[PDB]
C-alpha cells in the first residue's frame, strides 16, 4: 500500500542487514587502534570495503521511495541520509590517491620526530616527549626549538600532501553537490524545515561569527592578564602591547592555555584546585578515575557503564609492547557495545577527560533505541558538549572537596573563586579564538579565498588578528602549520570544539536551574540531582531523530546558540580581570613580532 509503508519495510531490512556489517567494521577498526600493525590495516580495509559496497547499493535503492509521499519525519530523515549518499563520486585512481595521502599525513603526524641540535642521536616524538616539553617547559629557547622543530620536520612534509588533499576533498565535495569541502563539513548542523525556516549551512558561519565578536571583551581581558604575567617568566621576550608568542602558550599550538596556570595563578598562596598532586598522593589509578566518573553519572539518574565496557575497553596504555592510538575516543561499535580508548595518566586533565568521554558513551547508550541511521548526536557540537557539561560540575571546588582531593577544612571565598574561574578560563575561553581562527582558515582555503602562495602568510595574519598570537619565527610557504595539529592532518572538522563550548554552558544553566541551584552559575554542581539527569536523558534519547534546534528548545527553552550563559558563568572573573588590567594594556598590535622589533 502506502509508499511510506513500503519505505518502512525497506529501512527495516536495511537496519538488520546493516547491523553485522557495521559491527564487523567497528570491530576491526578497533582491533587496529588497540593493536596497530600492517595485518590489522588489511582487516580494516576489507571490512570497511564491505561497509561501503552495501551502503552504495542501499543508497541507490532508497531513491525508489520519493520523499514527497513520506508523511513521518524520522522515516523521511532516514530516507534522506540514505538517498543523499552513494559512493560513485571520484575516479578510482583519485580515491586511491586521496586515501594514500590521508594515510601519509596521519602516519607522518604520529611518527614524526625532532632531534636536538646538539645530539642528532636523541630525538623526541610528539605524543610523549614534545608534548611534555611544550606543556611544562619554562625556557624560551627550549620551547622555540620544539615549536619550530615540529613545524619544520613534520609540517614541511605535510605541505605538498595537504595541497593535494584539499583539491581532492573539494572535488569529492563538489560531486556531492556542495560548494566546497567546508560546506560539506558544515552540513552537520543543517536542518530541513518546519515553515521553510531551518538551519542553513551559511547560518552556522553567521552565528559562529556573531558569538566571536560577543566573546571579544572577555577573551581580550584574559589575554592582557596572561600577557602581563608571562612578562615575569620570559622577561625580555613579551611586548606589553604586542601579540603573544605562539610557542609560549602551554601546549604545542596554544590550543588551550590551561598549562599556563602555574605562571598565571591569581592567588597562589591558597591551596590548589589542580588536584593532580592530591590524586597521585592518594593512590589513584586508571580504574579509580573511571569508577569515580561512573559514580557521578549514576548520581544524576543515568545508567552504570555496561559490563562489556569494563570488560573490553583500553583505559591505559598496555605494557605488552602493542602500539596504540593514545588519542582519546569514545566508541559506539553497535549491538550495545560501548568502549573507551585512552592512555590514562593520573592527572586532573585526564580525570576531566574521563568524564568527557564517559559523556560521549552516555549519549550513545540513550539514543540506542533510535533507528540505526538516527543514532547520532543532534549535531557534532551536542555530542562534544554533553561530557563537558558534566565536567563543569565535577570541576567545582565544592564538588572536589566531597571526594577527597581538597582538604575538608579548605574554606572557599573570593580568592579561591578567582583561582578556579581563572583556571577554567585558560581552558575554555583561551580556546575559542583559536578554534575559530583554525576552522575559519580552513573554510576559506576550501572556498579558494586563500591561494597556496599566501597560505602561511594569511594563516599568521589571522593568528595575529583574531587570536592575538604571533609566530616567533617567520614561516614561508614550505611550512604547513595548520597541519601540525592532529585534527587538521587527520581530516577532522574542528568547529565542533567551538559550538560545543557555547552549548555546554547553555546546558549547564538549564540543568542547574532544574537542580534549583540558588546562586551563581559557577558554583553549581548538579550531583545527586536526578531531575537534572532525567531532563538531560530526555535530550540524549532523541539522537538525531529530530532537528537539533527543536531538541535544543526542549532543554534551554531556546532554539539558538547563545553565549549569554558562558558570559554569566565567567562574569565574576571578568570584572576581576577588569580591575587587574587597569594598569595593563588590553588588546594587541598585530605589527609587533619577536623577530623584528
Amino acid at each position: 500500500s502506502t509508499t511510506e509503508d513500503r519505505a518502512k519495510i525497506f529501512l527495516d531490512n536495511f537496519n538488520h542487514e546493516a547491523e553485522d556489517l557495521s559491527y564487523q567494521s567497528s570491530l576491526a577498526s578497533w582491533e587496529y587502534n588497540t593493536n596497530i600493525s600492517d595485518e590489522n590495516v588489511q582487516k580494516m580495509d576489507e571490512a570497511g570495503a564491505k561497509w561501503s559496497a552495501f551502503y552504495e547499493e542501499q543508497s541507490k535503492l532508497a531513491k525508489n521511495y520519493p520523499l514527497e509521499e513520506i508523511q513521518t519525519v524520522p522515516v523521511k530523515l532516514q530516507l534522506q541520509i540514505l538517498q543523499q549518499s552513494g559512493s560513485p563520486v571520484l575516479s578510482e585512481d583519485k580515491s586511491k590517491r586521496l586515501n594514500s595521502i590521508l594515510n601519509a599525513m596521519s602516519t607522518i603526524y604520529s611518527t614524526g620526530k625532532v632531534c636536538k641540535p646538539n645530539n642528532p642521536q636523541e630525538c623526541f616524538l610528539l605524543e610523549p616527549g614534545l608534548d611534555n616539553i611544550m606543556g611544562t617547559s619554562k625556557d624560551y629557547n627550549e620551547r622555540l626549538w620544539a615549536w619550530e622543530g615540529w613545524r619544520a620536520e613534520v609540517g614541511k612534509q605535510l605541505r605538498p600532501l595537504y595541497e593535494e588533499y584539499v583539491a581532492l576533498k573539494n572535488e569529492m565535495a563538489r560531486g556531492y553537490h556542495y560548494e566546497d569541502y567546508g560546506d560539506y563539513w558544515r552540513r552537520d548542523y543543517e536542518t530541513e524545515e518546519s515553515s521553510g525556516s531551518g538551519y542553513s549551512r551559511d547560518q552556522l558561519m553567521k552565528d559562529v561569527d556573531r558569538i566571536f565578536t560577543e566573546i571579544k571583551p572577555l577573551y581580550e581581558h584574559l589575554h592582557a592578564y596572561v600577557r602581563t604575567k608571562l612578562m615575569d617568566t620570559y622577561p625580555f621576550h613579551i611586548s606589553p602591547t604586542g601579540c603573544l608568542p605562539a610557542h609560549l602558550l602551554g601546549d604545542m599550538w596554544g590550543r588551550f592555555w590551561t598549562n599556563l596556570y602555574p605562571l598565571t595563578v591569581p592567588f597562589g598562596q591558597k591551596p590548589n584546585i589542580d588536584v593532580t598532586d592530591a590524586m597521585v598522593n592518594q593512590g589513584w589509578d586508571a580504574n579509580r578515575i573511571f569508577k569515580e566518573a561512573e559514580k557521578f553519572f549514576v548520581s544524576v539518574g543515568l545508567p552504570n557503564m555496561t559490563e562489556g565496557f569494563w570488560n573490553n575497553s583500553m583505559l591505559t596504555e598496555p605494557g605488552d609492547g602493542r602500539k596504540v592510538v593514545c588519542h582519546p575516543t569514545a566508541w559506539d561499535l553497535g549491538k550495545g557495545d560501548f568502549r573507551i580508548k585512552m592512555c590514562t595518566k593520573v592527572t586532573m586533565e585526564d580525570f576531566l577527560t574521563a568524564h568527557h568521554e564517559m559523556g560521549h558513551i552516555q549519549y550513545d547508550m540513550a539514543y540506542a533505541t533510535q533507528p540505526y541511521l538516527l543514532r547520532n548526536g543532534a549535531n557534532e557540537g551536542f555530542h562534544e558538549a554533553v561530557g563537558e557539561v558534566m565536567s563543569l560540575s565535577v570541576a567545582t571546588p565544592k564538588h572536589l572537596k566531597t571526594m577527597g582531593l581538597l582538604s575538608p577544612d579548605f574554606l572557599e571565598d573570593n580568592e579561591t573563586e578567582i583561582n578556579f574561574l581563572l583556571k577554567q578560563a585558560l581552558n575554555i575561553v583561551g580556546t575559542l579564538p583559536f578554534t575559530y581562527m583554525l576552522e575559519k582558515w580552513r573554510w576559506m582555503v576550501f572556498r579558494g579565498e586563500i591561494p597556496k602562495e599566501e597560505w602561511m602568510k594569511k594563516w599568521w595574519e589571522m593568528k595575529r588578528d583574531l587570536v592575538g598570537v604571533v609566530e616567533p619565527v617567520p614561516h614561508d610557504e614550505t611550512y604547513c602549520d595548520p597541519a601540525s595539529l592532529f585534527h587538521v592532518a587527520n581530516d577532522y572538522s574542528f568547529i565542533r570544539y567551538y559550538t560545543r563550548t557555547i552549548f555546554e554552558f547553555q546546558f549547564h544553566e538549564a540543568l542547574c536551574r532544574i537542580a534549583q541551584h540558588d546562586g551563581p552559575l559557577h558554583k553549581c554542581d548538579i550531583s545527586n540531582s536526578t531531575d537534572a539527569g532525567k531532563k538531560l536523558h530526555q535530550m540524549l534519547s532523541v539522537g538525531k531523530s529530530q532537528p537539533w534546534t527543536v531538541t535544543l528548545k526542549d532543554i534551554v527553552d531556546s532554539r539558538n546558540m547563545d553565549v549569554g550563559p558562558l558570559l554569566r558563568y565567567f562574569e565574576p572573573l571578568y570584572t576581576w580581570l577588569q580591575e587587574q588590567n587597569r594598569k595593563s594594556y588590553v588588546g594587541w598590535n598585530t605589527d609587533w613580532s619577536p623577530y623584528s622589533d
Partner: protein, 195 residues
C-alpha cells in the same frame, strides 16, 4: 511412575531457532520442579498463573516445553500480551497463558569469535501469529503491489535473517536460551504431577 525428562529439554546440547521453535510434550510423569527453582543460573524465571513453589503440590494433565534461542533484549517479549518481532512473527504466548518462562545467558555456548550465525528469526509476515503457532515457510514476503512470484528484489524480501553472536556483544544482544513450560488444564485425568 518415574520422573519427568526435564534435563533433556533444559540441558540439551543444541537449541532450535525461534522461527522454528521446538516443543516437547510432557505426559504420564511425576516431576520435582525444585531443581529448576534452586538452579540460580537463570537470568529470567517468570511464572504466570502459578507459583514455582506451588508447582510441587500441583497435578497437570499435560506439560509442553518450548525451547529456542533469542537475544537478551528480546526475552521481555516472551510474555502474555507482548508485541515485537519475536511475539508478532516467531513465538506468541496467549493471554490466558498459564506456565513459566525460563531463560539464561547462553553466550559461552552460542557465541563464537567472528560471530555465530546458526540462529535465524523471522523479520516480516503478512499477519501476526496466533498463540503457539509456528511458521517455517520460506516464502518471499510481498511488501509491494507488484508480485515478486519468483524471488528477491525491490519491495520483496526473504523473511528469515540470522542472528550473529560475538563474545563482545552487549548483553541485550547476547544469545539467551529460553524454555517455556505451559501447564494445560485438560478435561481428562491429570498425568503430570509434582512431589
Amino acid at each position: 511412575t518415574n520422573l519427568c525428562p526435564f534435563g533433556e529439554v533444559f540441558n540439551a546440547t543444541t537449541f532450535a531457532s525461534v522461527y522454528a521453535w521446538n516443543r516437547k510434550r510432557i505426559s504420564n510423569c511425576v516431576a520435582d520442579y525444585s531443581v529448576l527453582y534452586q538452579s540460580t543460573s537463570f537470568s529470567t524465571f517468570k511464572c504466570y498463573g502459578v507459583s514455582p513453589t506451588k508447582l510441587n503440590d500441583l497435578c497437570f494433565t499435560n506439560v509442553y516445553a518450548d525451547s529456542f534461542v533469542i537475544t537478551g533484549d528480546e526475552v521481555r517479549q516472551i510474555a502474555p500480551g507482548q508485541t515485537g518481532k519475536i511475539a508478532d512473527y516467531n513465538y506468541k504466548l496467549p493471554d490466558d497463558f498459564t506456565g513459566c518462562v525460563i531463560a539464561w545467558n547462553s553466550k559461552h555456548i552460542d557465541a563464537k569469535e567472528g560471530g555465530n550465525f546458526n540462529y535465524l528469526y523471522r523479520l516480516f509476515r503478512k499477519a501476526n501469529l496466533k498463540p503457539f503457532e509456528r511458521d517455517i515457510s520460506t516464502e518471499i514476503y510481498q511488501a509491494g503491489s507488484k508480485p515478486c512470484n519468483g524471488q528477491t528484489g525491490l519491495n520483496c524480501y526473504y523473511p528469515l535473517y540470522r542472528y550473529g553472536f560475538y563474545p563482545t556483544d552487549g548483553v541485550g544482544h547476547q544469545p539467551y536460551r529460553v524454555v517455556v513450560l505451559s501447564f494445560e488444564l485438560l478435561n481428562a485425568p491429570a498425568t503430570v504431577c509434582g512431589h
